[PDB]
């Protein structure tokens, strides 16, 4: 069961899932994720990156590092094994130098994400209403303008559709200069499933699918955070 990931994390006194575990968990619910492998060796990364196909992105899986980029734990666009290979040591040094307290679960090999329209799907627990799903467009629209919608879970198809249409940046989903309309149905599906994750798993205090890329066909979660309690 995918619940084993939650149990393992609890047993190890951890209060969030590691990035790859979060995506496995999410994926088990039918929410599409960018493909990933956890590299336990310079050799395995380079293979996993050979396997997943190219380019790849590399970053550090550690229970101890949270904002990765400013610690130098994120390397990118690595088409050849050799292109990657320097990155494996490159990040290792950078985290060793700046987080020697940190535990190194391994290095993460991340499949590439063609650009698209970015989205946020969140799950929180409101004291009154319990598991609540939130939606908004990525970048400055959630982060700066706070343009988000909420629905108390479980979500009906009506809930999902209307909360998408509700945000001010909604027209970013229906075609604009240099961007086709994206798969609204696929967004709705993910919103509903996010709500289901909250209703069913009491051990999850919070979830953040950010960023999520919307395409004309399908969506893909690029990064996922799952907080435990």
């Amino acid at each position: 069961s995918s619940r084993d990931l939650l149990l393992k994390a609890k047993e190890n006194g951890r209060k969030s899932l590691l990035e790859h575990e979060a995506k496995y968990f999410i994926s088990s619910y039918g929410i599409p994720v960018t493909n990933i492998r956890l590299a336990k060796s310079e050799e395995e990364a380079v293979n996993f990156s050979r396997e997943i196909g190219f380019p790849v992105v590399l970053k550090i899986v550690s229970p101890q590092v949270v904002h990765k980029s400013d610690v130098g734990g994120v390397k990118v666009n690595l088409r050849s094994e050799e292109e990657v290979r320097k990155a494996y040591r490159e990040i290792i040094e950078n985290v060793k130098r700046n987080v020697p307290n940190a535990e190194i679960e391994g290095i993460l090999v991340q499949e590439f994400a063609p650009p698209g329209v970015e989205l946020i799907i969140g799950l929180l627990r409101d004291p009154q209403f319990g598991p609540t799903v939130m939606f908004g467009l990525g970048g400055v629209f959630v982060e700066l303008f706070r343009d988000v919608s909420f629905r108390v879970a479980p979500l009906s198809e009506q809930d999902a559709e209307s909360m998408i249409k509700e945000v001010k940046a909604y027209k970013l989903l229906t075609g604009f200069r240099g961007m086709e309309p994206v798969d609204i149905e696929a967004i709705k599906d993910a919103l509903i499933r996010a709500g289901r994750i909250g209703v069913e798993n009491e051990e999850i205090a919070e979830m953040d699918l950010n960023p999520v890329i919307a395409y004309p066909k399908g969506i893909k979660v690029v990064d996922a955070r799952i907080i435990l309690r």
Binding site: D126, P127, Q128, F129, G130, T132, V148, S149, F150, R151, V152, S156, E157, Q158, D159, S162, M163
Partner: protein, 464 residues
């Protein structure tokens, strides 16, 4: 128990804390119970009195030779637990605790113990810190508020004390017919969900208005589930206290509670099919229209006006509420062209011009209501020299009757004292009438907002 049938329709009610002194709260409640005409048994309870207001008085509820359904408790907080114990022993099912001095002044322990003790005897608690409750079908006024209300189908639930008891009086002024008034105050036990469940099943109640400051932790899901199903058949209007951040803090300290999230309450209200009013006036204007009208079957809303300016005020007000007018059906335009001049407008609003005499309101209103392709009607009147306000109003009444059907109608009338009387005349006949075109248009907008809210709920409950 979860069933409140015998809270609202008790065979016997005790008033604990009534006094030889008629100024005390218990005595005021007892006085209101008798004057409003309760037909069950009333048992004044007082340590020494032999009789109060012509009724045998007892020192304890447990000494009453009868099954008491409801104990209205008006003794100081330090004596309340004692009275609960006695009520518990006597087998009382509902304790209506008037008394203040609980969670709202920081004494949490006392409130939790009040509830704990009530429940150990299977007794439910309304309150504490409330002004009581009224239920018109049982001729039961167990409040210390006004002695009377207009009878009707609106249930009003209030978490606020002072505003609640004052709005109880305001219903009379606004001609709103009441089925029930319930003060819920601190909501230590019985709360909105419990009451909504009762009013759902109550055939005397058609509309539910709630002044709501907050919902208890862990109670919100159940609230949505219950309100949702109620909204399928009965409109719920909520006056939300603290719907801005600074106001959320303002209600957080008046009540003994932390402020919940504004945005999530608003989504919950949307998922429940609930209409959120930002003001007392909006809530009462909407309650009135929802109380006296069926919901519109469709979107063919017609506005009838003798003034272009009033008609544009209405158009703007409808637009702000997401309601857009469409050209009227050709058959209606033809019906009306039989008596209006050529410089009349038919864009919707239908402008019958400023020289319209009284009877054109009768003929116009009738034609619109009788027409198969008209779903709803807003009639606007500006007082000119050629009309009489009361004549226009009687024409609207006669046209509603002669049409036979029930399509929603609202009326907006502008003018001097004669208009104020005509408006009052219409409201006393349960025709939703207002002294401005924007209020008449806002009231009709609520009828549509409710149709749309019901639809939101129906679609959300769709089977997969």
């Amino acid at each position: 128990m979860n069933d409140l049938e015998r809270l609202f329709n008790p065979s016997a009610i005790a008033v604990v804390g009534a006094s030889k002194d008629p100024s005390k709260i218990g005595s005021q409640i007892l006085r209101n119970l008798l004057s409003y005409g309760f037909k069950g048994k009333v048992y004044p309870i007082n340590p020494t009195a032999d009789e109060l207001m012509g009724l045998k008085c007892y020192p304890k509820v447990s000494d009453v030779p009868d099954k008491v359904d409801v104990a209205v408790i008006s003794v100081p907080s330090d004596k309340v637990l004692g009275v609960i114990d006695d009520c518990g022993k006597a087998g009382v099912k509902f304790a209506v605790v008037i008394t203040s001095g609980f969670k709202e002044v920081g004494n949490e322990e006392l409130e939790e113990e009040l509830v704990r003790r009530a429940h150990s005897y299977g007794m439910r608690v309304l309150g504490p810190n409330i002004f009581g409750y009224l239920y018109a079908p049982a001729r039961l006024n167990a409040t210390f508020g006004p002695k009377d209300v207009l009878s009707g189908n609106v249930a009003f639930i209030s978490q606020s004390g002072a505003l609640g008891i004052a709005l109880m009086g305001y219903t009379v002024v606004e001609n709103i017919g009441i089925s029930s008034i319930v003060s819920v105050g601190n909501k230590a036990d019985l709360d909105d969900v419990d009451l909504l469940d009762f009013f759902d099943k109550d055939p005397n109640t058609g509309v539910i208005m709630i002044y709501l400051e907050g919902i208890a932790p862990g109670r919100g899901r159940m609230f949505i589930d219950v309100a949702s199903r109620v909204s399928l058949r009965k409109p719920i209007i909520v006056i939300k206290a603290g719907r801005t951040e600074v106001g959320a803090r303002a209600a957080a300290s008046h009540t003994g509670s932390i402020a919940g999230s504004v945005a999530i309450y608003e989504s919950a209200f949307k998922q429940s099919g609930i209409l959120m009013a930002k003001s007392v006036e909006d809530a009462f204007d909407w309650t009135k229209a929802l109380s006296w009208n069926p919901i519109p079957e469709g979107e063919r809303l017609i506005v009838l006006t003798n003034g272009g300016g009033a008609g544009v005020q209405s158009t703007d007000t409808f637009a702000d509420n997401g309601i857009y007018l469409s050209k009227p059906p050709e058959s209606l335009i033809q019906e009306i062209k039989k008596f209006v001049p050529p410089f009349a407008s038919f864009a919707n609003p239908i402008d019958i011009t400023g020289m319209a005499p009284d009877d054109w309101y009768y003929m116009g209103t009738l034609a619109a209501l009788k027409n198969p392709d008209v779903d709803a009607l807003t009639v606007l009147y500006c007082q000119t020299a050629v009309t009489t306000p009361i004549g226009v109003a009687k024409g609207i009444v006669d046209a509603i009757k002669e049409a036979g059907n029930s399509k929603p109608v609202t009326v907006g009338m502008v003018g001097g004292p004669e208009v104020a009387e005509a408006v009052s005349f219409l409201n006393k006949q349960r025709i939703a009438a207002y002294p401005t075109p924007e209020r008449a248009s806002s009231a009709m907008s609520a009828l549509y907002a409710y149709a749309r809210a019901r639809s939101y709920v129906m679609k959300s409950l769709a089977v997969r």
